[PDB]
Design a protein around this ligand. Structure first.
Ligand code: SF4
Ligand code: SF4
Ligand code: FES
Ligand SMILES: [Mg+2]
Ligand SMILES: [Zn+2]
Lengths: 86, 48, 96, 125, 690, 208, 115
């Protein structure tokens, strides 16, 4: 239940990563200022699919597809992961 | 070789030896090169 | 210039002798270790340096076509002698 | 009359190769790099297939170099990258393909050695 | 377009204006014979081997220097060209010494090959040959000048590429000689490339002398790890032994050059090697043991402790596979104390944004820059090929170069603004003329060395440099897609570890001293046992006996970079993989295999078993690590700058001083080069000339 | 030219070119190419379906009378889609001439057996099957000829290792000769002999 | 269409029928091989080995490859029936002098560098 790190894999120019690119361009700064001590790794994918990774205690990690999501849906998913949901 | 002796050289054997196979003088092959990889020697003193 | 190791094994011209704790020594038990006694480095070290009166000397190893390819050796440096890259003979210009 | 098979080519069961040297081998498909000691480029024309390097050890007698993988010297030559890829696939070998490297065209000018104001001017010939 | 039409043996060729006959010939797949021509050096035109006949032209021309005219028909295999080649080869071989059996160039000699291909088969020279005396230019390059053909390739390389004007010719006629005219050593970080460029055996490698022949060596294409440049190399092996290192042509990284540390430090791989697992006996001394016992002890100590009590430090020569393996192993213990020796500022975006710690302009982008500013770095010794590219663009593009830091010699002239770090603030505020110089530049470049970040005020320096870059961005407008912020690394393992989520620096270990410490090749001495509690369990996994090893309780012998197929990330951010040239010596094993075996022994088995699965895990963590030549990436300078404006840590009144000031500090910088006897000879030579 | 250079024979060159044109005209259904080499050797390239008709025509025609099969072999070129090049060498005693007929096949496409045309083809086809794995349809008795009993693989393929996969020794426990994976005390040393400079400009290929 | 020439079978069903006929022939031959070669194994061991060799290639889906495998099996059976093979050749199917090589990761890690 203890969140250790967040990984966001967005492709640079794929159509399906437009929402993730918009989120990172707009609200990533406020998201990082809300969690100053949380690793939020921004990495680039090849054209397969966008994904989000959350790593919990003792090496357990979960992944969720962010494909075709908008900025609002990405924000919803991130605030769900950062809180006691799912 | 009496009328035509061979050429004398300082490195030529002065005593001919026959086939020494089957005897304690037999040739035993071995690698003639040095050890290639040198291992690290740990210190001989305690560390605390 | 043969030399014996602290174990008694004759050290060859290439400098290889088994370590006292090396099991491969057992191949020489009841037998011998073949070692050539004419060390070439010592033999070539005994040859005198030839005095020649030219800046460039030619060496073919002696014997004409029975030697090595003929090379030409520069002898301008008085600090060191001119050595043949094939035979090891040494040449120098008159000094002193 | 023909039979119209519809499956990808696979001949692994007919080559007599042990299972170890089919599923655990990694072949590299590449154009060999020019030997930097020389300027000739005739050895960088074709594609090569080579296997992954395995263990070599000293022979207790004679100190020779010993091997246990039969594919340590096998090198194949191909005219194109696709031919090598097809050969590797039909033989069932996992492959890594490296794109061909070509030296870029360069602008050479003998008159640049003697420039009026540029730094390309040479101090010696 | 602007292309003109020429013919090579009657075949139409469309070439740009200024193209030489040789380049037009190579466009149709023919290589003109050459000795003095090198495509990366200036045109000399002295050897005359490239003489070729132009149709309807009585006199043959030099294909290397002559621009081709429109409508020209180059006759490359006519009688005139062949007879010219034969005459030139005859003149070249008239005085050449009969040294092929004793020459190291034999079997890979351009003179031999071009005599076999374009010359005659016999001699008609009936005179005596000339002999010249040898020159001592250092302990790296062996010199036998009788084999010299007076091509002048070495002089041009020294003048243009290495920036050292110590080589030249003395005398004239048949007595012209190539040398220094005085007893002087040609000691440079790029000095070893004159061996490669030399067509003949006049210049040869001294450490490599007499050991092997070219036809018996097996070629393994791999990647250099002696710095963060990631130069492509070829490892020459014969009968399971590494023989020498040769450059491999990569246009965007190193072209066809390598540094002297890259070329001559391979012999350190043969000394001070960890071959067997070791443990501590009852006397406190290291004793040989089997893998089972050492792994059982490590697994027991791992199961005993948990969480913050477990930590790991990564060294400078660590591959990504072992990095992710160790990260997973400590994550299954609920430990996040995965740290590197190299320090990067974590304040702000930190490691979250990849562009915050990358050479964003890329090495090939240096050739497009108009002005470059270097902050607190000595690129000549920290990244020799990056400095070589800087000098190349300085020579061919009149690049404007400035430096903040100690006034070191960069082999090119630059503006020295000073060493005080307050100059960064002065430039950012606009009180400096270089602020205007940067404002009016079309393609400005700012490079901050990772060595300057190894200071207590490193975050302040990064913030100031980012502020300078932001001022450039806002003032000069948007150039399109051009990146101004750049971080120059010096450690091969740093970028890969940062991509995986390792904490830069080793501050987390001083904040919470751990009971169990994993030294994954850490030989920097960042933490000794004085920084750790008593009875601390220290595990060192590596390949050399260096400062890290003798303070450990269990030693796990690993593989060197020439003994594994491993991934390394460049300063640019380009992932590259090495290949296996030889196998690890003795009982040493692949590093990720050691970590996976340890995880299985401790019961927390990792999900992967093969190298493809390790790379799939790498793709899961950071997908850029499986793109093996990609250098493209998204730019997030705006967010990083905004997050870096949050904290205002102060600068120190200390002049910026790079760790390497002279050549003597360049040779021995890591575990492999410290065990190298060739590097010891180099240091001895540069310390006292003699 | 003269003392050291091989002399030419234009008369045989024209005769062989004319006969190649003749054969190509008579059998357009199967002939794909006809070549004459500069040392006066005639080569005819055919489709694999034409193995029997072309050989029968060359044996039985009054103007051909190639009654002797000199040799039949295969060449392995891994870079081609059709791996195996099947070469027939024929001799005519009536006209004192030789001819070469060439076709192609891959690992799974059978080639028609020629034992009905030439009885000599029996063992040659057996050897081709043994060394390359090319199956010959309607062969009276097709089986290994050169390799050991139970031998796996086809040694003459370019991807077969030179030393193979198994080696033999006598084992005292089982009191028989056993086969085990190969280990070599000294590994065969691969030599890189090819010069980086081109030797023959007359064979230079387009740079693609 | 893929335009491929067959060897024996038009599709996989005739290939399966040929495989079954070859299996029947080998199953019949096994006791005679045990008697003639004076083998120390039992008939059950020989038939289990024949089944193992047949199931080794169970994944094949190409009828041409199946036909070639059947051809090779018939060649092997003809060698065995005619006593062209010797006892060493028959016993090479059992690998009685090769040590059992472990499969788990830890044992391979301990013994050497091979994956
Ligand atoms: S430089 Fe070349 S031609 Fe001259 S001696 Fe050496 S190998 Fe022979
Ligand atoms: S040393 Fe080599 S590069 Fe320099 S002039 Fe002589 S042959 Fe040319
Ligand atoms: S290559 Fe043109 S003169 Fe030397
Ligand atoms: Mg050279
Ligand atoms: Zn001599």
């Amino acid at each position: 239940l203890g969140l250790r790190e967040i990984r966001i894999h967005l492709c640079q120019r794929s159509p399906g990563s437009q929402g993730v690119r918009d989120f990172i361009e707009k609200r990533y700064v406020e998201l990082k200022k809300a969690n100053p001590d949380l690793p939020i790794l921004i990495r680039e994918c090849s054209d397969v699919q966008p994904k989000l990774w959350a790593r919990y205690a003792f090496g357990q990690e979960k992944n969720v597809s962010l494909n075709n999501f908008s900025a609002d849906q990405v924000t919803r998913t991130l605030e769900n992961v950062l809180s006691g949901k799912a | 070789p009496t009328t035509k002796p061979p050429t004398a050289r300082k490195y030529i054997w002065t005593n001919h030896k026959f086939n020494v196979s089957g005897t304690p003088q037999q040739y035993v092959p071995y690698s003639t090169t040095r050890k290639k990889i040198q291992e690290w020697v740990p210190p001989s003193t305690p560390y605390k | 210039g043969v030399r014996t190791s602290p174990t008694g094994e004759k050290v060859t011209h290439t400098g290889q002798a088994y370590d006292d704790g090396d099991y491969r020594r057992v191949r020489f038990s009841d037998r011998q270790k073949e070692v050539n006694e004419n060390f070439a480095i010592d033999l070539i070290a005994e040859q005198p340096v030839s005095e020649v009166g030219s800046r460039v000397i030619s060496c073919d190893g002696g014997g004409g076509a029975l030697g090595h390819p003929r090379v030409y050796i520069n002898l301008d440096k008085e600090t060191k002698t001119g050595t043949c890259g094939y035979c090891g003979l040494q040449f120098r210009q008159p000094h002193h | 009359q023909l039979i119209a098979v519809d499956e990808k080519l696979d001949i692994t069961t007919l080559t007599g190769v042990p299972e170890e040297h089919i599923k655990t081998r990694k072949v590299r498909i590449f154009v060999p790099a020019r030997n930097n000691m020389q300027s000739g480029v005739n050895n960088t024309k074709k594609w090569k297939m080579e296997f992954d390097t395995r263990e070599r050890w000293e022979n207790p007698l004679m100190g020779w170099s010993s091997t246990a993988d039969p594919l340590s010297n096998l090198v194949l030559t191909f005219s194109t990258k696709e031919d090598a890829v097809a050969f590797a696939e039909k033989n069932g070998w996992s492959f890594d393909v490296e794109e061909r490297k070509v030296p870029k065209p360069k602008s050479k000018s003998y008159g640049a050695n003697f420039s009026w104001n540029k730094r390309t001017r040479v101090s010696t010939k | 377009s602007n292309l003109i039409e020429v013919f090579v043996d009657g075949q139409s060729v469309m070439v740009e204006p200024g193209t030489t006959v040789l380049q037009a010939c190579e466009k149709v797949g023919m290589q003109i014979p050459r000795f003095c021509y090198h495509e990366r050096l200036s045109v000399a035109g002295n050897c005359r081997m490239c003489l070729v006949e132009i149709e309807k032209a009585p006199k043959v021309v030099a294909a290397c220097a002559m621009p081709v005219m429109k409508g020209w028909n180059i006759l490359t295999n006519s009688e005139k060209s062949k007879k010219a080649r034969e005459g030139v080869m005859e003149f070249l071989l008239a005085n050449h010494p009969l040294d092929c059996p004793i020459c190291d160039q034999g079997g890979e000699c351009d003179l031999q090959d071009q005599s076999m291909m374009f010359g005659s088969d016999r001699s008609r020279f009936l005179e005596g040959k000339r002999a010249v005396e040898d020159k001592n230019i250092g302990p790296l390059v062996k010199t036998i000048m009788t084999r010299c053909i007076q091509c002048t390739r070495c002089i041009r390389f020294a003048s243009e590429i290495a920036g050292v004007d110590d080589l030249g010719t003395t005398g004239r006629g048949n007595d012209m000689q190539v040398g220094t005219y005085i007893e002087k050593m040609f000691m440079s970080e790029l000095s070893g490339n004159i061996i490669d460029i030399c067509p003949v055996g006049a210049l040869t490698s001294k450490p490599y002398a007499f050991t092997a022949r070219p036809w018996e060596t097996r070629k393994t294409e791999s990647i250099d790890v002696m710095d963060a440049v990631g130069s492509n190399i070829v490892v020459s092996t014969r009968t399971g032994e590494v023989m020498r290192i040769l450059p491999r042509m990569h246009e965007d990284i190193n072209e066809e050059w390598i540094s002297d540390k890259t070329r001559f430090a391979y012999d350190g791989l043969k000394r001070q090697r960890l071959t067997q697992p070791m443990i501590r006996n009852e006397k406190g001394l290291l004793t040989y043991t089997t893998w089972e016992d050492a792994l059982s002890r490590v697994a027991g100590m791992l199961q005993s402790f948990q969480g913050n009590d477990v930590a790991a430090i990564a060294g400078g020569l660590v591959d990504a596979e072992a990095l992710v393996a160790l990260k997973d192993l400590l994550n299954r213990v609920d430990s996040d104390s995965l740290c590197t020796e190299e320090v990067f500022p974590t304040a702000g975006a930190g490691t979250d944004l990849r562009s915050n710690y990358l050479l964003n302009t890329t090495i090939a982008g240096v050739e497009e820059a108009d002005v470059i500013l270097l902050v607190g770095t000595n690129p000549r010794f920290e990244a020799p090929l990056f400095n070589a590219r800087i000098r190349k663009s300085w020579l061919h593009n009149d690049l404007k170069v400035a430096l903040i830091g100690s006034p070191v010699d960069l082999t090119y002239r630059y503006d020295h603004l000073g060493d005080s770090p307050k100059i960064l603030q002065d430039i950012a505020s606009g009180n400096h003329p270089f602020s205007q110089i940067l404002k009016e530049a079309k393609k400005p470049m700012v490079v901050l060395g990772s060595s300057a970040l190894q200071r207590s005020d490193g975050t302040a320096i990064l913030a100031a440099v980012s502020n300078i870059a932001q001022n450039i961005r806002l003032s000069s407008g948007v150039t399109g897609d051009w990146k101004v912020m750049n971080i120059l690394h010096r450690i091969a393992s740093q970028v890969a570890a940062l991509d995986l989520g390792y904490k830069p620096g080793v501050e987390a270990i001083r904040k919470n001293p751990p009971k169990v410490l994993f030294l994954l090749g850490a030989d920097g001495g960042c933490i000794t046992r004085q920084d750790l509690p008593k009875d601390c369990f220290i595990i060192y996994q590596g390949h050399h006996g260096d400062v890290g090893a003798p303070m450990a309780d269990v030693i796990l012998p690993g593989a060197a970079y020439t003994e594994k197929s491993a991934t390394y990330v460049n300063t640019e951010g380009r992932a590259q993989q090495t290949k296996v040239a030889v196998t690890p010596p003795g009982l040493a094993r692949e590093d990720w295999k050691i970590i996976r075996a340890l995880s299985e022994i401790a019961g927390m088995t990792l999900p992967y078993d093969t190298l493809d699965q390790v790379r799939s895990r790498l793709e899961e963590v950071s997908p850029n690590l499986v793109r093996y030549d990609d250098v493209e990436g998204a730019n997030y300078f705006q967010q990083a700058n905004e997050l870096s404006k949050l904290v205002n840590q102060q600068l120190l009144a200390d002049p910026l001083v790079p760790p390497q000031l002279t050549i003597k500090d360049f040779y021995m910088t890591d575990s492999i080069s410290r065990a190298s006897q060739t590097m010891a000879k180099c240091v001895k030579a540069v310390t006292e000339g003699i | 030219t003269r003392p050291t250079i091989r002399p030419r024979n234009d008369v045989v060159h024209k005769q062989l070119s004319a006969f190649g044109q003749y054969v190509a005209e008579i059998l357009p259904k199967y002939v794909q190419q006809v070549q004459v080499s500069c040392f006066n050797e005639l080569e005819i390239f055919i489709h694999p379906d034409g193995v029997i008709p072309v050989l029968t025509f060359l044996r039985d025609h009054t103007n051909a009378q190639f009654k002797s099969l000199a040799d039949l072999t295969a060449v392995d070129v891994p870079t081609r889609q059709n791996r195996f090049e099947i070469v027939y060498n024929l001799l005519s005693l009536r006209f004192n001439s030789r001819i070469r007929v060439k076709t192609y096949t891959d690992e799974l496409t059978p080639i028609e057996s020629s034992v009905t045309v030439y009885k000599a083809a029996n063992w040659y086809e057996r050897e081709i099957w043994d060394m390359f794995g090319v199956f010959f349809a309607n062969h009276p008795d097709l089986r290994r000829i050169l390799t050991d009993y139970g031998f796996e693989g086809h040694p003459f393929r370019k991807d077969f290792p030179l030393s193979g996969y198994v080696e033999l020794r006598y084992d005292d426990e089982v009191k028989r000769v056993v086969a085990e994976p190969v280990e070599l005390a000294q590994e065969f040393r691969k030599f890189d002999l090819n010069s980086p400079w081109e030797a023959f400009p007359a064979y230079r290929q387009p740079p693609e | 269409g893929t335009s491929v020439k067959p060897i024996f079978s038009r599709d996989m069903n005739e290939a399966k029928r040929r495989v079954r006929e070859l299996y029947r022939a080998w199953y019949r031959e096994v006791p005679n091989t045990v008697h003639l070669f004076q083998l120390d194994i039992s008939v059950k061991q020989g038939r289990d080995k024949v089944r193992e060799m047949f199931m080794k290639n169970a994944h094949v889906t190409d009828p041409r490859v199946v036909d070639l495998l059947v051809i090779k099996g018939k060649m092997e059976l003809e060698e065995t029936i005619n006593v062209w093979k010797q006892r060493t050749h028959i016993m090479r199917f059992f690998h009685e002098t090769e040590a059992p090589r472990p499969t788990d990761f830890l044992s391979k890690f301990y013994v050497g560098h091979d994956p």
